[PDB]
């Protein structure tokens with residue numbers, strides 16, 4: 519029988535044993551719920567590396583039509599999929615205590631609610647289901663937005679995306695990892711860019727914190743803190759994000775230096791930005807990374823790079839895709 523995940527009882531060990539069984543050639547898995555059945559073909563993401571404080575996190579994806587992705591670390595696992603345009607995450611932490619902390623963290627803003635947030639049991643809490651689209655309606659959270667600032671190689675070039683937990687912030691591994699995954703997926707979906715770049719995300723803590731709620735001033739201080747950091751000398755040519763759970767003033771979800779990374783000339787920590795990592799705004803880091811790689815605001819409301827927050831995870835503008843791919847060392851002759 520085809521392997522299956524029962525969404526009425528999915529636990530960390532369910533997801534871990536299914537995903538640890540995914541070989542280089544992929545594996546069919548059926549997602550099952552009441553009135554719901556989706557067969558997905560899962561493959562390991564061999565292009566993206568993630569360490570969160572040296573903890574290794576692996577990524578998996580269904581086919582494009584499957585609208586399904588997974589995250590797996592030693593401490594947590596995520597299944598996220600889209601149904602009727604809504605992003606549904608099943609979040610499962612291995613240790614009971616942390617799973618309870620996570621459930622209480624997600625339950626707190628809500629104190630039809632089960633359609634937005636539900637603890638999943640097998641008695642014993644095994645995961646939480648969050649429908650962020652229903653959750654934002656119930657919590658009447660604002661639209662939010664952005665507004666930001668100014669030859670196929672033999673092997674893909676490794677580019678580190680160094681993510682720095684803002685001092686005094688608390689972020690959760692499932693939430694940070696989801697942002698990194700959508701950011702990585704958003705780049706690889708463009709012009710076969712896996713042939714050109716392999717993104718390596720790391721998360722550390724920084725002493726820096728924004729002195730105000732102004733995202734512009736915060737980014738100025740962040741980029742300056744990188745230049746003044748001895749640990750970072752010699753790494754001025756990588757990509758940097760300051761991350762927090764929350765947003766900035768004026769419902770600003772993130773900010774970055776526009777068109778500031780190019781594989782030939784990257785330097786001086788110019789390729790820096792800031793991003794929220796909270797679950798209800800997927801794709802913010804993807805959006806800011808697109809800006810860093812040269813993407814500008816697109817007109818299509820279904821584009822990741824639309825000026826307001828849309829919830830879409832993929833570049834649609836041919837012009838942006840060109841600019842991003844060019845900055846990563848591709849050219850039109852290379853095709854897709």
Ligand SMILES: [Zn+2]
Pocket residue numbers: 664665666805809815824825
């Ligand atoms: Zn923007």
